[PDB]
Copies of this chain bind each other. A is one copy, B any other.
Amino acid sequence: VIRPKTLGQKHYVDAIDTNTIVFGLGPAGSGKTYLAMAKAVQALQSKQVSRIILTRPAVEAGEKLGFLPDPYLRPLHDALRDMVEPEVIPKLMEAGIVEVAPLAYMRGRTLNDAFVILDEAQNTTPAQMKMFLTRLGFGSKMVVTGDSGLRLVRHILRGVDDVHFSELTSSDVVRHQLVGHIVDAYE
List residues of A whose CB falls within 8 A of some B CB.
Answer: 20-21, 29, 34, 50-51, 71-72, 74-75, 78-79, 81-82, 86-87, 89-91, 94-97, 104-105, 107-110, 112-113, 126, 130, 133-134, 136-138, 140, 153, 156-157, 159-163, 175-176, 178-179, 181-183, 185-186
Shortest distance from the beta carbon of A15 to any chain B beta carbon, whole Å: 15
Report yes or no: A137 in contact with B94, Cβ–Cβ below 8 A: no
Report yes or no: B185 in contact with A160, Cβ–Cβ below 8 A: yes
Q: In chain B, what residue has the closest Cβ to A82?
A: B112
Report yes or no: A96 in contact with B89, Cβ–Cβ below 8 A: yes
Report yes or no: A75 in contact with B176, Cβ–Cβ below 8 A: no
- Given known A130-B182, A182-B157, contact A95–B86 (CB-CB < 8 A): yes
Shortest distance from the beta carbon of A99 to any chain B beta carbon, whole Å: 9
> How far does the alpha carbon of A125 sit from the alpha carbon of B95 in the complex, in Å?
36
Report yes or no: B178 in contact with A21, Cβ–Cβ below 8 A: yes
Report yes or no: A74 in contact with B136, Cβ–Cβ below 8 A: no
B-chain residues with CB within 8 Å of residue A21 when the two chains form the complex: 178
Report yes or no: B136 in contact with A162, Cβ–Cβ below 8 A: no
> How far does the alpha carbon of A178 sit from the alpha carbon of B157 in the complex, in Å?
10
B-chain residues with CB within 8 Å of residue A108 when the two chains form the complex: 72, 74-75
> How far does the alpha carbon of A99 sit from the alpha carbon of B89 in the complex, in Å?
14
B-chain residues with CB within 8 Å of residue A51 when the two chains form the complex: 81, 86
> How far does the alpha carbon of A156 sit from the alpha carbon of B96 in the complex, in Å?
42
Report yes or no: B186 in contact with A107, Cβ–Cβ below 8 A: no
For this complex, 5 residue pairs linking A to B, each with C-beta atoms less than 8 Å apart, are: A51-B86, A78-B109, A82-B113, A160-B181, A162-B178
Report yes or no: A156 in contact with B134, Cβ–Cβ below 8 A: no
Shortest distance from the beta carbon of A80 to any chain B beta carbon, whole Å: 9
Report yes or no: B95 in contact with A133, Cβ–Cβ below 8 A: no
> How far does the alpha carbon of A90 sit from the alpha carbon of B138 in the complex, in Å?
24
